[PDB]
Design a protein around this ligand. Structure first.
Ligand SMILES: Nc1ncnc2c1ncn2[C@@H]1O[C@H](COP(=O)(O)OP(=O)(O)OP(O)(O)=S)[C@@H](O)[C@H]1O
Ligand SMILES: Nc1ncnc2c1ncn2[C@@H]1O[C@H](COP(=O)(O)OP(=O)(O)OP(O)(O)=S)[C@@H](O)[C@H]1O
Ligand SMILES: Nc1ncnc2c1ncn2[C@@H]1O[C@H](COP(=O)(O)OP(=O)(O)OP(O)(O)=S)[C@@H](O)[C@H]1O
Ligand SMILES: Nc1ncnc2c1ncn2[C@@H]1O[C@H](COP(=O)(O)OP(=O)(O)OP(O)(O)=S)[C@@H](O)[C@H]1O
Ligand SMILES: [Mg+2]
Ligand SMILES: [Mg+2]
Ligand SMILES: [Mg+2]
Ligand SMILES: [Mg+2]
Ligand SMILES: [Mg+2]
Lengths: 25, 580, 379, 189
């Protein structure tokens, strides 16, 4: 008859960042 | 000033383990250091192979004077990034100290720097609006061959992190530190024995060292060879040190090594204790009191488990891979559940009717990297890793897609299975039992002829048409469950009656059934083609139904006693509700 | 936990890599063995190799409170390691040790608590005790081979039914003093036995202790003096039925009259079909009486007959009579083989993994309910 | 909602893991239960043990606002638990408990509100009220077996027709005052 296709679902990696500051003086 | 540690001084006070062997790898590192440009050796390999050992063994050898005179008396400095980066809040503080150390290194010109886990220097001192990072600072010096440095990174940490920076990668020479041979590891542990022997105040035999390396390789598969053998030896020494509670101190023999390896690998301990030996002795008899008949199935299971504990198991195959086929209502799925109970091991049940789709394999072994289900992992692979000693029950295996039977191939032939995360699941101690109903219609169906025929063979041909030859050639046995006999039904009826009594005991009610009444129940419910399941429906209609009407509203609301007997003239059971 | 504790001591007395990691499922008692290792040390029921040793539980959150400045986290973290190494007797217990794999990383740098501690662990100067779930360890901890290689995994399994009864017995004074109640011996046994049968989403040591703590609070809240200061078996059964959302073991007086007249009420709504009504009522009566199937549904009937004879109506009216939810599932939509995914969800890595199975989710949401599969033959 | 509140109070008196979790569908009153216990306390319709206690509603946005620097979130969150631990008469109410799984995680940042509240709930020093939907409880909250073990699921069921008409009558004064209209009793039914 017919072939039942399957659709895979991709996952993306997104990561937040933090900044460690250095006092000027 | 206090960021680098002189390994030569540490090596001279006996604080660095001795480097045994690895002459080929050592010469390559030394040859790289004697180059003009790109003279920075980078030791890359798996974890536990001995990368740090070689980087530290170089200073150990320099002190002893066995290294070539081309670089004799060279000072190897081990840099710890933690001390360097610490206390660098102010702007330019990290660069002042880092550049100071490099200035000192160049002034000496006869000193080498060792940075363990050198992948971490990328972005070590960087910050928002960062002036410079440690990686960029060393780039000039390395390109000009001014200073020689020694790195150490794993393969996983040499591609995602280090290969990205092509500039730094070009100034380093990758060295594949392969794991040593089984024979080479024995030599390594022989030289290291005095250090571990003095710590635990124990002595290791020659056979014990060899048995550790051999047993660790064939049981421990999540660690490398120079890291697991030392763990077996180290753990054996501590047990030996603490074992003399009554001063029962003696030499560390092979038996002690076997015991520690078992706990690390969670495999059943060798030289099974008398308490466990008794369980396997009467395992068949204990099972025969809960599952009547089907003696061939109980024998195969019990014999397979015994052989594996006695040492005469399979090299890299599960304890047993049995395909329990036969009619319905027989003890196919029950004997497996009772086996896990008697053995006291976790029962891994997998209803294979939920894997009818060919793409359901992703649930068993996990989704590949980059997909939504990668984090979840595989159910079967994770369940086995959690409980290495278990009973894997695959019920209704024939109700799954033909592609789910190709995974079990390696499980039976190689005893392993690789999930999405690359982890290996060990099935060498799992009792794989698969229950099927292949060709059940045939057994129910009767032949068109004067003489009826046995359809046991007809159900075997269906199995062959469902499972491929390769699948059927790796199964320890294919057991056929014969139909329940009349004598068996009487035992089965008593079993269900006992279950009823237990439920009644929780309510303070008692029940007594005579053998005359028990025989009557067997005839009404006995059906050779439907097995024992109809016996639970007859009991429900004849015993549970009347009792339920009394328990909710009657004499058994607050306990009582019942007597069940049959009337011969009317051939019907009589229920006596004594009260209490 | 003598066997599990002994293994931890052996690892602690090692020369190198003397860090006993404690892996296990949630609620098994991984943290109990770590915190309990100190309780034993004060009493003195421990070998002399570990006697006089100290344990320090690490709070990763407090350590990262004020480390915004560059090289502020490393400085304090390194200070703690120096104290442990110079003390030569203390032990650092890092609960949820899978969190140090990205601690103190601001920029795209690989300098974190795991890298900082790695050289010390490989030298055996400090002893560290970890604790991680199976999923966490396999997905986060085991991804770092270098850090994993420095820890000795010690798998701990939930105790036996008999073993967990002794655990509750030892904990009885603490819980009894908090609620000012007394727990009977039968109550502890019933909690363990009943929680294993009904509560199937938790583990035996933690779930059993959850029934004992919940029951104690209920008794105190009650104003009646006789029930207060004591916990009978009936109290435990009500608590378990509440948590599992199942009918109480002992039938209430309100439900005793409903079951008695359930058949007559259904007969008036749907005439005839006495056999069908009797089977449903009898099965329900057995289930509420307690002498039901050990691990099978109350009843699994297959109604077969002509059209318009009362098959769907009797089922629809059974839920209304019992005041329970009706899980109506039309099987005509499941004619295709691939429709099974709807019932149990799609496999991992597919578009529908998040949605989940309709049947499984509906049953979990409404465990006590009537499941009607109309036109199942069409499926 | 007498039985729901009664079970919630029973859980809040537990020695350990005294954290009631209100799970239900969308439309059912879950936040109201947590936000109605406060109204009950001021009015005085609460047991003596649950009296003189203030329920604090935690907002994730305010807690994660302006915390780009390392450790700013940890400081704010640790300070909250400290002030809440020394009170012993305060209950934290999180409207969406499924959102603490990845609140502070920056890059493989397992150190987050989910992994930071665990030692507090296990020690029974604080009391936390949760709220989440079935679609988000099973797929987000239930994934963290450790966090889900410290929260006692309290299922909330859709009220019956008779129960709902009483609710409408209780809210009728505030609704009547806003629109400046009076709804008839027949209209509510
Ligand atoms: N050739 C060798 N001779 C002597 N000891 C060795 C040798 N190779 C490995 N070892 C020992 O094996 C153990 C682990 O090797 P190390 O070099 O310390 O590992 P490593 O490279 O630091 O591991 P990571 O941090 O996981 S990459 C230590 O006890 C080493 O001294
Ligand atoms: N030989 C037996 N002795 C005692 N009880 C039995 C026996 N065979 C079956 N039963 C009972 O029959 C019920 C079903 O047992 P199962 O092991 O599930 O049967 P099965 O033949 O594997 O079932 P299917 O549906 O054909 S896969 C349980 O209540 C068992 O205890
Ligand atoms: N032998 C035991 N003695 C005391 N408490 C025990 C024991 N076994 C289990 N527990 C339980 O353990 C609780 C303390 O938390 P644990 O169960 O140790 O946490 P855990 O399993 O380490 O947690 P995570 O989240 O999985 S790391 C106690 O309140 C008990 O309910
Ligand atoms: N025994 C009955 N007593 C009272 N009303 C009935 C009875 N049987 C059917 N009805 C009425 O017929 C409708 C119910 O029919 P159903 O029971 O749903 O039919 P059905 O058995 O599902 O039909 P199929 O799907 O064609 S086999 C309602 O309008 C009922 O009031
Ligand atoms: Mg190393
Ligand atoms: Mg079966
Ligand atoms: Mg814990
Ligand atoms: Mg119908
Ligand atoms: Mg809400």
């Amino acid at each position: 008859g017919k072939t039942n296709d399957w659709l895979d679902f991709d996952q993306l990696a997104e990561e937040k960042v933090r900044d460690a500051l250095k006092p000027p003086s | 000033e206090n960021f680098t540690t002189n390994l030569n001084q540490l090596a001279r006070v006996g604080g660095i383990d001795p480097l045994i062997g690895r002459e080929k790898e050592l010469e390559r590192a030394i040859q790289v250091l004697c180059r003009r440009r790109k003279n920075n050796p980078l030791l890359v390999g798996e974890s536990g192979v001995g990368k740090t050992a070689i980087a530290e063994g170089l200073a150990w050898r320099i002190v002893q004077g066995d290294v070539p005179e081309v670089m004799a008396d060279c000072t190897i400095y081990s840099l710890d990034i933690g001390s360097l980066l610490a206390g660098t809040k102010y702007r330019g503080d990290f660069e002042k100290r880092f550049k100071a150390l490099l200035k000192q290194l160049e002034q000496d010109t006869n000193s080498i720097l060792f940075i363990d886990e050198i992948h971490t220097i990328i972005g070590a001192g960087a910050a928002s609006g960062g002036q410079v990072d440690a990686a960029n600072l060393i780039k000039p010096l390395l390109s000009s061959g001014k200073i020689r440095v020694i790195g150490s990174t794993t393969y996983q940490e040499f591609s995602n992190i280090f290969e990205k920076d092509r500039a730094l990668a070009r100034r380093f020479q990758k060295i594949d530190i392969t794991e040593p041979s089984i024979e080479e590891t024995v030599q390594i542990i022989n030289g290291l024995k005095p250090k571990y022997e003095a710590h635990h105040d124990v002595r290791y035999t020659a056979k014990a060292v060899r048995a550790a390396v051999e047993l660790a390789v064939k049981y421990i598969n999540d660690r490398h060879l120079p890291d697991k053998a030392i763990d077996v030896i180290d753990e054996a020494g501590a047990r030996a040190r603490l074992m003399p509670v009554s001063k029962r101190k003696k030499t560390v023999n092979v038996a002690d090594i076997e015991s520690v390896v078992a706990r690390i690998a969670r495999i059943p301990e060798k030289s099974v204790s008398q308490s466990d030996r008794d369980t396997l002795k009467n395992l068949g008899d204990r099972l025969k009191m809960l599952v009547f008949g089907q003696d061939k199935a109980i024998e195969a299971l019990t014999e397979a488990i015994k052989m594996a504990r006695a040492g005469l198991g399979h090299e890299h195959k599960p304890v047993g891979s049995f395909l329990f086929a036969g009619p319905t209502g027989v003890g196919k799925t029950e004997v497996t559940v009772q086996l896990s109970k008697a053995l006291g091991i976790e029962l891994l049940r997998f209803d294979m009717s939920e894997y009818m789709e060919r793409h359901t394999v992703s649930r068993l072994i996990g989704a590949p990297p980059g997909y939504v289900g990668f984090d979840q992992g595989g159910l079967l692979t994770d369940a086995v890793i959690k409980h290495p000693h278990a009973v894997l029950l695959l019920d209704e295996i024939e109700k799954a897609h033909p592609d789910v039977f190709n995974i079990l191939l390696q499980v039976m032939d190689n005893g392993t299975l690789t999930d999405n995360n690359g982890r290996k699941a060990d099935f060498r101690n799992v009792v794989l039992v698969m229950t099927t109903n292949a060709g059940v219609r045939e057994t129910e169906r009767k032949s068109i002829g004067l003489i009826h025929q046995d359809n046991s063979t007809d159900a075997m041909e269906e199995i062959k048409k469902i499972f491929t030859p390769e699948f059927r050639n790796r199964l320890d046995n294919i057991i056929w469950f014969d139909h329940l006999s009349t004598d068996v039904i009487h035992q089965v009826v008593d079993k269900f009656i006992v279950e009823l009594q237990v439920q009644l005991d929780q309510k303070g009610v008692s029940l007594e059934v005579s053998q005359e009444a028990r025989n009557w129940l067997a005839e009404k419910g006995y059906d050779r083609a439907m097995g024992a399941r109809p016996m639970a429906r007859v009991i429900q209609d004849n015993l549970k139904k009347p009792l339920a009407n009394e328990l909710l509203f009657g004499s058994l609301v607050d306990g009582g006693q019942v007597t069940v007997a049959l009337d011969k003239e009317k051939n019907e059971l009589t229920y006596g509700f004594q009260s209490a």
